[PDB]
Ligand binder design. Sequence first.
Ligand code: COA
Ligand code: COA
Ligand code: A12
Ligand code: A12
Ligand code: CA
Ligand code: CA
Ligand code: CL
Ligand code: CL
Ligand code: CL
Ligand code: CL
Ligand code: CL
Ligand code: CL
Ligand code: HG
Ligand code: HG
Ligand code: HG
Ligand code: HG
Ligand code: HG
Ligand code: HG
Ligand code: HG
Ligand code: HG
Ligand code: NA
Lengths: 229, 229, 464, 461
Amino acid sequence: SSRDLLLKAKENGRKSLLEHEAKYFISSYGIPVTNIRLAKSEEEAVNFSREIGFPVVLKIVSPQVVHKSDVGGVKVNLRSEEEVRKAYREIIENVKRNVPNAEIEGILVQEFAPPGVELIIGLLRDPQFGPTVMFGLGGVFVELFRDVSFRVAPLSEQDAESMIKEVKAYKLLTGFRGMEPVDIEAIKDALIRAGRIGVENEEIAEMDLNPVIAYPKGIKVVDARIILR
Amino acid sequence: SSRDLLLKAKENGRKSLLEHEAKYFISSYGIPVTNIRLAKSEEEAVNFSREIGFPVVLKIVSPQVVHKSDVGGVKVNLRSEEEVRKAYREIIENVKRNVPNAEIEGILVQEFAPPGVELIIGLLRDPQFGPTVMFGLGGVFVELFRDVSFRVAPLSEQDAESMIKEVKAYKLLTGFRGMEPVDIEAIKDALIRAGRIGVENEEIAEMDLNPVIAYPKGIKVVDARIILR
Amino acid sequence: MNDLERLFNPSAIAVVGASKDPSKIGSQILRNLLSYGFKGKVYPINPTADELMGLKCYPKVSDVPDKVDVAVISVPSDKVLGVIDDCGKAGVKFAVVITSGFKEVGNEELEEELVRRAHSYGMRVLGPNIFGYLYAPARLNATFGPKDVLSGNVAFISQSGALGIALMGYTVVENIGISSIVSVGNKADLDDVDLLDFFDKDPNTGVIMIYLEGIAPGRGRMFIDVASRVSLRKPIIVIKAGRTEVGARAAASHTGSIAGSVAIYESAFKQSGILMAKSVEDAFDWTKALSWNPIPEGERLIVLTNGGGAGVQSTDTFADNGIYLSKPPESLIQEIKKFVPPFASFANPIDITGMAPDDWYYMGTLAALKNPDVDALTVLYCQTAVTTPIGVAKGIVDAIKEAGNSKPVTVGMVGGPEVAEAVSFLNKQRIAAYPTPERASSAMSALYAYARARSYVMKSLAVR
Amino acid sequence: NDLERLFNPSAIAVVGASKDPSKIGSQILRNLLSYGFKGKVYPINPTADELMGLKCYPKVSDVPDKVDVAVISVPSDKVLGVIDDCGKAGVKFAVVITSGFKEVGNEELEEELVRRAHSYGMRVLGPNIFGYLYAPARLNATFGPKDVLSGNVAFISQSGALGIALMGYTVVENIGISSIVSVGNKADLDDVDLLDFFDKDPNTGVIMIYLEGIAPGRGRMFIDVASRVSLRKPIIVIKAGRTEVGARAAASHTGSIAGSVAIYESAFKQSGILMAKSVEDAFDWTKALSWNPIPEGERLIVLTNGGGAGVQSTDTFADNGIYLSKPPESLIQEIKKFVPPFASFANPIDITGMAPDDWYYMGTLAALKNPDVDALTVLYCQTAVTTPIGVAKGIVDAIKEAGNSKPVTVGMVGGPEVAEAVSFLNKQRIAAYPTPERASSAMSALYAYARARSYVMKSLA
Ligand SMILES: CC(C)(COP(=O)(O)OP(=O)(O)OC[C@H]1O[C@@H](n2cnc3c(N)ncnc32)[C@H](O)[C@@H]1OP(=O)(O)O)[C@@H](O)C(=O)NCCC(=O)NCCS
Ligand SMILES: CC(C)(COP(=O)(O)OP(=O)(O)OC[C@H]1O[C@@H](n2cnc3c(N)ncnc32)[C@H](O)[C@@H]1OP(=O)(O)O)[C@@H](O)C(=O)NCCC(=O)NCCS
Ligand SMILES: Nc1ncnc2c1ncn2[C@@H]1O[C@H](COP(=O)(O)CP(=O)(O)O)[C@@H](O)[C@H]1O
Ligand SMILES: Nc1ncnc2c1ncn2[C@@H]1O[C@H](COP(=O)(O)CP(=O)(O)O)[C@@H](O)[C@H]1O
Ligand SMILES: [Ca+2]
Ligand SMILES: [Ca+2]
Ligand SMILES: [Cl-]
Ligand SMILES: [Cl-]
Ligand SMILES: [Cl-]
Ligand SMILES: [Cl-]
Ligand SMILES: [Cl-]
Ligand SMILES: [Cl-]
Ligand SMILES: [Hg+2]
Ligand SMILES: [Hg+2]
Ligand SMILES: [Hg+2]
Ligand SMILES: [Hg+2]
Ligand SMILES: [Hg+2]
Ligand SMILES: [Hg+2]
Ligand SMILES: [Hg+2]
Ligand SMILES: [Hg+2]
Ligand code: NA
């Protein structure tokens, strides 16, 4: 599905897909992503924001910026034209100051996903077992506690379901104080498709979907990184 | 004597100390609490807030209201006189509606404690072992995952320190993304004192300090429940 | 080719490196081949010997007036490639290379050349750096390990040399009947996947146990494809070496490789239906139970015990394995109440009381096994003065015989020297017996764990 | 209280012995005599003129002597009468074998038993027990096996059949015993009382307890006493009911309420107690703790002739929170004087699969003598170039010549010759096991006790 993005990246000596390319790529595999627009100017950012609908999110797009929040390159819940303009300039200044030698490809405009239960979905290439899908709850649960499950791809439905139920923070998905159970079927479907992406695209070394926001109905990938080899 | 609070409660056929009494009582054991001004009127609420300093928090005080948030009886980050007045009336109406037959002792005014790492400190009585101190991280970590540690009282410093390091969510106390390590010594001190409360006061069946906010320096008990037998 | 029939069942085996000097490894292997009763032809290969062990010796395999299936090679590494070439000329299909001094000591190049040359003649390599192999159905002991094993249906594959050859001996002490021992060492060519394909087809093999350090890059997907289908019919138990981060880091240096992912190996084993053992003792305890019992047909597990203590240890151990006991069927309760006092507990475990005589072990076991709503039985016995361990053991044997069915049973016995004897007696009759209630319960748990592992793979293979 | 005259009585009565030798009272009298008790023994029976060649009396109060201990083996409906007579006679301890009390729902009979005994200043062991043994006093007042191996381990058991079975099993596992105490229903004397005695007892160096639960209000004292014991002697508890379902189960076997799993586990940690999840672990650890000093530091060396066993060891140690570090360079140099160059010295030290017997002696000796080595686990896989017994004798000789006392455990894997070698080592009080993981779990218990003792030292200031 749109292998052309991977081929173009290789042809141009890039070792990764950027957020908008990564989201387009996994979207073509049936993983729900945010609507997105690459704005080259503050004016395009405003116009794209109206097209997407408020509130929106703006993010830096640059090869030299992998961790966008850490350098002030992410602004969420922008509710008006004026807030979009303010955010636009703030991001550009933050990146020029923190990453002087950064090639600014533009500013990505995307829908604002409302709060839900955050997940991480990963793909890596294991020397022995090949493409392997990773799952965990978002934030501290994977990043600090390292609570992750793995299944070697391709995944069956049995693999996807059991690897979800397996993680220690699983109960965050089945209802707790102030939060309804989220759509486990949509998660399973995303995990299987992540496995297919790895099986079918040998030039993909890693994929990181962090975070994926899960809702009572469906999920939505809010950030995406694909690393090539 | 702080024991007058316990004796008075028994005399009046109460089975618990209410927030202001519970905080006063544990404060007399050296556990840090919030200001506890009991306002009888909207006017007193305003005056107390100005004295305490903004921001403040308002809470319902009533024998018939154990879970104050669940019935709309808690208002936080109130930064002005008008906002205090709004919240005051808002709470009264919520309680009137959700718990018609509630004896309103008043509205508690307290500082709004800045965000930190939330903890739970508990006291229970085991048939074999007597007073036992419980520790865990706040929110889902105790309430959903049941990640708790226990030490039978009285606690040594070694008991207090080890029971903290023991819980699976311990790393939330020692520095993670966007959060400094918190004051382990202040936590240990509170745990030892909770144990002493349990050893010395036989008419106390249970204590629940939920949440206790921990900072790089010191802690602050923000809610407190004492159950009598 | 990938057909190993004539590796395990050769008509002719050559031993290259046997000597008039009997202390040499080539000579030890030749001695074992003869001692263990190989019925085919054996050809000692030595540069000068007229004969070795009463058998005509030749200077090279290519001079043998016969088609040699397997050449067991026991010469120094600087002599191996030459021997491979002659074996090639002679058309030998398998080179079993005992010789050390290849990749495990940094000579990757010599090892890769070994395999290239072998493949150039249509010849496969086992090893190098191995202690050989044994195949009981063919009365074939081509190792320099112990001369004999107990015959049975367990195939043991070992990536480790010293631990492998030692465990070969340990099978005898633990009464484990063996169909095969295979030392795979450096795994330069033939590996676990090839061997699993053979033991899958092998009617003599009912259980496969593997000591596994790691598999080769790019080999894992096929490992899962083969293992998962084998697991539908035969249990695979893996002793994983480097199952901890520190063990994997350390073990990485054992042969000088990259540390394999602990977590991903564990998932691969789960997707393969494989049981991972964390110790030798668990691996052997489970292997024994799986070797000698059918899989339970349901979840109606009964524990029979004299006195509550052993029963509680059993309950806790089953729970740690995610096995929970349910109240026994009323039909069984009434049957047992015909001889048990009213102060007995029937909660499951069934407590026939600490002072139960020998006879009640016979009657209780028989009643349980015969009951149609009982799928499996663990019998626990604490030695006291009112019983005899051997009497209890024989009561269990007789009950299993008279029940005439095949339901999984494990036995735990706690006591002095007489219990050690009774447990040995039971194991020699292929009744899985252990000296503690927890080991008896863990062994029964492996039967259920294998049923669950198989169910995982089946669910994974379910047609849409 | 003082249990001196329980464990070292000058006079013991057996109530319920009979001309019928099959009866339990008679079995106890037999054991008492055969095991060689030197004090006075008084059979008590309603009619017998003599039993086992000893003058028999109809009541303890008729005995012209002061009886310290009365072992009572009569039916429950006869116990209270005997308690009254014993009380009249001034006996200090009633060891009540008899079943049919709280464990079968007769809580009131049990409470009446204890209150009647207390009214005469008399303490109760049990009821519903198989008795007790104390080797230093050549005292076998059980109806269990006639003999045990002598040593420094005291075993307390809340379970009857499992306890008496394990009493026999100590012999198979070569565990030397100072005491066996069946406590059963624990109506009076309990673990706290016994720990207080064994704390002082120079004959006892290790205490192992099969524990279902302790009585309400008794846990705090349990921690106070246990933690103090732990400063000098390791306590291993086999906890019955370590799971929710197990705790419920065990609860009805004794007729109690199920105790909190998590709070018991906390109490053990506060006490410096090692909790074993199985008989095998409890016995393996007991053996090691009985025969070794605690490590003085963390410089643990693993010596192996095969990398496989070494990896198994490394993994097992790691599961117990024990991590190996590089060996001292001086040890590496010493061992490099006889080891081939392709040997690994990362720790485990791999002396290679082709090591002859002699290298086990030299390696074990070098390690134990090295001042920067605190502990040693030696692992041996049998091959044709060695003999298991030769390797075993080499380890014995190395341990003697080192002349010091550092913890050692041994793992040996192989055939019947290895089983013999392991037995040989164990019969010399060298902790040997038939797998590397068990040798490593056994060494891990030494470090766990070192850490537990440290916990308690810090807790007690
Ligand atoms: C394979 C190994 C055992 C050979 O060592 P070795 O027997 O001492 O070596 P030798 O030089 O004596 O060779 C053995 C015999 O083969 C003979 N030989 C050598 N080249 C030969 C050839 N091309 N064809 C036939 N015989 C040959 C030698 O002459 C000698 O016979 P001899 O006694 O009549 O002279 C050794 O090199 C080795 O690798 N050992 C380690 C094995 C190991 O650890 N495996 C792992 C399992 S734990
Ligand atoms: C204690 C117990 C063993 C006694 O049973 P018992 O020996 O069959 O009972 P008996 O009626 O025969 O009493 C034993 C003897 O004491 C005698 N006796 C009775 N009352 C007596 C008294 N007041 N003073 C002295 N002797 C008395 C009886 O006459 C009998 O002797 P005899 O053979 O000369 O008639 C039994 O009641 C019991 O509780 N057993 C359960 C033990 C158990 O399973 N525990 C679990 C741990 S594994
Ligand atoms: N479309 C969106 N809707 C809502 N929140 C979003 C969002 N995109 C990003 N966020 C939030 O902002 C955080 C940082 O954004 P990214 O994950 O894209 C940047 P980074 O990982 O490179 O620092 C996310 O983890 C999420 O909390
Ligand atoms: N003084 C204070 N400062 C800051 N936050 C406070 C606070 N008092 C209460 N809170 C917040 O408000 C929440 C609800 O308050 P309580 O814990 O008193 C009410 P409840 O548990 O009875 O429903 C707390 O969990 C905490 O997050
Ligand atoms: Ca991200
Ligand atoms: Ca609260
Ligand atoms: Cl020749
Ligand atoms: Cl040849
Ligand atoms: Cl048993
Ligand atoms: Cl008489
Ligand atoms: Cl009497
Ligand atoms: Cl070993
Ligand atoms: Hg020859
Ligand atoms: Hg050859
Ligand atoms: Hg085996
Ligand atoms: Hg038993
Ligand atoms: Hg008498
Ligand atoms: Hg008496
Ligand atoms: Hg013991
Ligand atoms: Hg070994
Ligand atoms: Na404090």
